[PDB]
């Protein structure tokens, strides 16, 4: 196969902006590249066929460039249609034809995280597992993670993280992390603590909770 | 023209499949017909790809000897024959007219997902509270916060599946302290709708 790497990872913009995409290849894919608008719950659509071409009923905002490795899809005036995720495919050496891992067009400063800590139910201590969970509210850039810790002891991949799209006004980022355990091992020990390291942080920070 | 796709449902590691395409708008003959994948939260896999009368075949790897792609010329579809089927290749199935590998029309996919039961909602105590939706499948799912009044300061978090393959999502909200405050938690998928009152 034939890597295509997209960047930015997210554009985010508010209608009349201009909107850049870039799409770079390991290899020379010639003028051979297409581009792919995809709006949401429906299905990708022909955009910018072979790098400058439009396909059948796509309008003008839309130009694209580039020969060899990298390329660029330009949407000089952003509409709200316009925002959709738009993939890269290159059709030089077929098969397979691979594809750009994506960039999405969102709509409308380093802010550390506010932390806090989760204590299991009780209603769920019954069926013989509990669920500790951490939350990492409101915060810029993405990039940061968490490490939970069972008495001051470094645990491992027994978490499982999620996060918010970017928000639209905050321009910030969400994040829980949820630790299960057994009840067993949950009644079997002491501090549960959520160390959160973060860009506008100078110093790591935590939450804990004896039980 | 009109790509459209069927097939798809819920299957098991070892279960098998079959899709297809039919066609409108045009003479299915003159073109190569494509299978494209988009697995959940992912991006654009191509598949597999089948020509104008039916001999060449080129397939993604990842598959054959498991994936066999075919057409009927004269009814107008295009088919898939999944079988070994696995998690991965949890997906939502798509099926792109070639023009050359220019899928220069696409159609609105078909659901393929490898793995039914409700979530148990429990209690997650300015302040933060909120609803832990755990153990469900398949998705999705929909948390309100007091009926569709509490909005500001809600994050209903994406899910994660798990080892078990059932998902579990959480939904937090941020208040003023000081009020009641109940999570509109509902599966669709299976019937079970929750409410859960927090304090």
């Known amino acids: 196969e034939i890597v295509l790497t997209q960047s930015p990872a997210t554009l985010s913009l508010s209608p009349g902006e201009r909107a850049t995409l870039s799409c770079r290849a390991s290899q020379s894919v010639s003028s051979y590249l297409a581009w792919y608008q995809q709006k949401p719950g429906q299905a990708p659509r022909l955009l910018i066929y072979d790098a400058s071409n439009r396909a059948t009923g796509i309008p003008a905002r839309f130009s694209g460039s580039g020969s060899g490795t990298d390329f660029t899809l330009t949407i000089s005036s952003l509409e709200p249609e316009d925002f959709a995720v738009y993939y890269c495919q290159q059709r030089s050496n077929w098969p397979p034809w691979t594809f750009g891992q994506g960039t999405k067009v969102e709509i409308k400063t380093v802010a550390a995280p506010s932390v806090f800590i989760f204590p299991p139910s009780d209603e769920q201590l019954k069926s013989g597992t509990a669920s500790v969970v951490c939350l990492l509210n409101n915060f810029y850039p993405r990039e940061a993670k968490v490490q939970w810790k069972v008495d001051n002891a470094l645990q491992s991949g027994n978490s499982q993280e999620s996060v918010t799209e970017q928000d639209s006004k905050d321009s910030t980022y969400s994040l829980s992390s949820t630790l299960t355990l057994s009840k067993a091992d949950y009644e079997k020990h002491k501090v549960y603590a959520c160390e959160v390291t973060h860009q506008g942080l100078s110093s790591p920070v935590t939450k804990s909770f004896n039980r | 023209v009109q790509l459209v796709e069927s097939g798809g449902g819920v299957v098991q590691p070892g279960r098998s499949l079959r899709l297809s395409c039919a066609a409108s708008?045009?003479?299915?003959?003159?073109?190569?017909m494509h299978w494209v994948r988009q697995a959940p939260g992912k991006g654009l896999e191509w598949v597999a790809v089948?020509?104008?009368?039916?001999?060449?075949?080129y397939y993604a790897d990842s598959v054959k000897g498991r994936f066999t792609i075919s057409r009927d010329n004269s009814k107008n579809t295009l088919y898939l024959q999944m079988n070994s089927l696995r998690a991965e290749d949890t997906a939502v199935y798509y099926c792109?007219?070639?023009?050359?590998?220019?899928?220069?029309?696409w159609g609105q996919g078909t659901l393929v997902t490898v793995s039914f039961k409700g979530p148990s909602v429990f209690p997650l105590a300015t302040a933060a509270l909120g609803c832990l939706v755990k153990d469900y499948f398949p998705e999705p799912v929909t948390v309100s916060w007091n009926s569709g009044a509490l909005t500001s300061g809600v994050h209903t978090f994406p899910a994660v599946l798990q080892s078990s393959g059932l998902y579990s999502l959480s939904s937090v909200v941020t208040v003023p302290s000081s009020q009641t405050y109940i999570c509109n938690v509902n599966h669709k998928p299976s019937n079970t709708k929750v409410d859960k009152k927090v304090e």
């Open positions: 708008g045009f003479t299915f003959s003159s073109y190569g």
């Open positions: 089948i020509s104008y009368d039916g001999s060449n075949k």
């Open positions: 792109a007219k070639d023009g050359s590998g220019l899928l220069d029309y």
